[PDB]
Design a protein around this nucleic acid. Structure first.
Ligand SMILES: Nc1nc2c(ncn2[C@H]2C[C@H](O)[C@@H](COP(=O)(O)OP(=O)(O)OP(=O)(O)O)O2)c(=O)[nH]1
Ligand SMILES: [Mg+2]
Ligand SMILES: [Mg+2]
Length: 373
DNA sequence: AGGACCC
DNA sequence: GGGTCCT
């Protein structure tokens, strides 16, 4: 099992789609989904009118005064539809990895091979692509890698069709030989379109990026380190001294990020299955005095309990997260956790009680249940 | 507990 | 306003 066919599915303006489906009157109006002072996402009509993702509400409403806004602080419906998407994809092939609420990877390698064994040495030359070919690259029908990726594009088109027919949702897909490249290529044509990457255009796709932060896997901190070292482009990263990179980022981060800079990524698509943790949050800048705010911890709990119940499995740990404030230097939240007594596993008041103590041990209040069994 | 990453 | 896995 060497060469892979991977699809990355990435839905369009996910919370906005869900809001437009719920309230048809919002369809073909420019629409922003708001959380506190942020317009976290907006539909493609708003993006034509200036509105950007994670743009603050003011900038957004003076870029576009008629922008309609709906509150998206409660994730219940987005989370529900998100699992519907994953389950539908799992029906195509069972190893589906989630990334956030609206991206999924599927390893289609077995499915592609089974479809190939089913065509004769006649219709093999009838194989055609579905959707865009990255960089308008010519297909070579005698290249077995090209043929597999095209069958991969046909499977992806069937996935996007089923999503739309069964769930009312549109999205993009990217088909490529690994997860890094499938995820880079899925965003090439948006919204609601798909693209496949043939191997000869891999360097073109990688060099299309304008900074190494654009590479999935390289974040805020790593990008700052590389900068400090004079590394700005993908090519700077590709040509940089492996030794020097090793003894600066650790052998782990360094060998992996350098491979990514070439388009190389051996990481497997992992079956996400059910979630590992369940949390709810609330934000209020300045607002929590450190006493008159327990009632908040009680709401978070009431709502979580219903979710964790419905799941069918139970958590064996609970955690309280907080954020403090005086100025905005970089990062730092705070957590205390402890196990959940097993009497209480099998509800409110004793949980309120455990939490009010983890509080006393210690803007933001969140509760997180984890260590599910 | 907290770090880095992700959407 | 959520999530993942590693140290
Ligand atoms: N609060 C918050 N929500 C986010 C953040 N990133 C993503 N989300 C939510 C809003 C999105 O609708 C959903 C999926 O994230 P994506 O990056 O795919 O953006 P979205 O689908 O809206 O846009 P797209 O059409 O994919 O460009 O997750 C973030 O940094 N903060
Ligand atoms: Mg995305
Ligand atoms: Mg999306």
């Amino acid at each position: 099992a060497s060469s892979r066919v991977i699809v990355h599915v990435d839905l369009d303006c996910f919370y906005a789609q869900v809001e437009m489906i719920s309230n048809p009157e919002l369809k073909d109006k420019p629409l922003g989904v708001q959380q506190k002072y942020l317009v976290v996402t907006c539909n493609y009509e708003a993006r034509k009118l200036g509105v950007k993702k994670l743009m603050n509400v003011r900038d957004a409403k003076e870029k576009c005064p008629q922008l309609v806004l709906v509150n998206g602080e409660d994730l219940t419906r987005y989370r529900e539809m998100s699992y519907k998407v994953t389950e539908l994809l799992e029906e195509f092939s069972p190893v589906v990895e989630r990334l956030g609420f609206d991206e999924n990877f599927v390893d289609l390698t077995e499915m592609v091979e089974k479809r190939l064994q089913q065509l004769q040495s006649d219709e093999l030359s009838a194989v055609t692509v579905s959707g865009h070919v990255y960089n308008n690259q010519s297909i070579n029908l005698l290249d077995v890698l090209h043929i597999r990726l095209l069958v991969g594009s046909q499977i992806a088109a069937e996935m996007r069709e089923a999503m739309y027919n069964q769930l009312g949702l549109t999205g993009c897909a990217g088909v490529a030989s690994n997860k890094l490249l499938a995820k880079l290529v899925s965003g090439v044509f948006k919204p609601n379109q798909q693209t496949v990457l043939l191997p000869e255009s891999c360097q073109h796709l990688i060099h299309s990026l304008n900074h190494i932060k654009e590479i999935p896997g390289i974040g805020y901190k790593t990008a700052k380190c590389l900068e400090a070292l004079g590394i700005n482009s993908v090519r700077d990263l590709q040509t940089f001294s492996p030794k020097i990179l090793e003894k600066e980022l650790g052998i782990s981060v360094a060998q992996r990020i350098q491979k990514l800079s070439f388009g190389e990524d051996n990481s497997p698509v992992i079956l996400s299955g059910p979630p590992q943790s369940f949390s709810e949050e609330d934000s209020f800048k300045k607002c929590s005095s450190e006493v008159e705010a327990k009632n908040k911890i009680e709401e978070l709990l009431a709502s979580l309990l219903n979710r964790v119940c419905q799941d069918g499995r139970k958590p064996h740990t609970v955690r309280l997260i907080i954020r403090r404030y005086s100025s905005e230097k970089h990062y730092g939240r705070e957590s205390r956790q402890c196990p959940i007594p097993s009497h209480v596993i099998q509800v409110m008041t004793p949980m309120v009680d455990i939490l009010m103590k983890l509080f006393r041990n210690m803007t933001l209040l969140s509760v997180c249940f984890c260590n599910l069994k």
